[PDB]
Amino acid sequence: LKASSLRALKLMHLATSANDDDTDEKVIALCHQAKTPVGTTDAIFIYPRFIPIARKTLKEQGTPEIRICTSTNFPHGNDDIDIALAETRAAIAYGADSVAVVFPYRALMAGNEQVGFDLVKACKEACAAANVLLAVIIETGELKDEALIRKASEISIKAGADNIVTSTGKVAVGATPESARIMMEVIRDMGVEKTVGFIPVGGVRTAEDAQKYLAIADELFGADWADARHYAFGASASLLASLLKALGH
């Protein structure tokens, strides 16, 4: 477990706990937390307008390698591609290393598969031209059905997603061991394990959970697959406190 909690800490994408009431001071506190006694988390997850100050802080503490992830079309997941695209172009210009666009899942739940494909594809073309990763949040907690979770995963992957994410963290249900396994099974069944990673958001509170979720990835792809590029824990500082507590900190 000590080996798992450290492995997980380095895969963490430390997310802000703010709800659009974030502040520069809170983001600076978050940047300092990403610098743990046992090493750095892979990235932080913050709102676009705080990327410049976060980048400044990360360079000031000697951790310029910590990546910055942000969100667009978030958390609503509306089906307006122009707005989602513009927000992605802004996140790119802010300096984001990765942009997590929210899939238009309500449109899928109403029977529209194309809008999600075009939306993801439009944002991927922008992130790719800027050397930025595009993650796609499909919001498993709202899709609920296994078939819809797979469909949204397949569509996102076909549209060029570099990572598929379970949840925004803003709805009733986030990641679960079931939905996480479903999405990773899609990555395997489509043979895209080399180019598509997985990120659970919302359902990983403790070190035991981090070990459980990593066990699924190891089981399905082997223990070597879950590196910084192909796996990450989108979670707040509470999980980091549990991961550190398991390591005696």
Which residues would be at the binding site for ligand 6NT (CB under 6 A)? 13, 15, 45, 69, 71, 98, 100, 135, 137, 165, 169, 199, 201, 232, 234
To the nearest whole angstrom, how small is the minimum distance from the Cβ of residue 167 to ligand 6NT? 7
Q: Please tell me the distance from the alpha carbon of residue 67 to that of residue 135, in angstroms, as a whole number.
A: 14
Burial-class residue 106 by CB neighbours within 10 Å (0-12, 13-18, 19+): middle
Q: Nearer to ligand 6NT by C-beta: 111 or 164?
A: 164
Q: Nearer to ligand 6NT by C-beta: 45 or 213?
A: 45
Distances (CA, A) of 239 to 14, 47, 178, 243: 9, 20, 20, 6
- Residue 78's CB is within 10 A of a number of other CB atoms, namely 15
To the nearest whole angstrom, how small is the minimum distance from the Cβ of residue 163 to ligand 6NT? 6
Q: Nearer to ligand 6NT by C-beta: 71 or 147?
A: 71
Helix (H, G, I), strand (E, B) or coil at 249: coil
To the nearest whole angstrom, how small is the minimum distance from the Cβ of residue 9 to ligand 6NT? 15
To the nearest whole angstrom, how small is the minimum distance from the Cβ of residue 6 to ligand 6NT? 19
Residue nearest to ligand 6NT (CB): 234
> What b-and-e string marks burial along 170-191, b requiring 16 or more CB atoms within 10 Å of the CB?
beebbbbeebbbbbbbbbeeee
Q: Nearer to ligand 6NT by C-beta: 207 or 232?
A: 232
Q: Nearer to ligand 6NT by C-beta: 68 or 186?
A: 68
To the nearest whole angstrom, how small is the minimum distance from the Cβ of residue 28 to ligand 6NT? 18
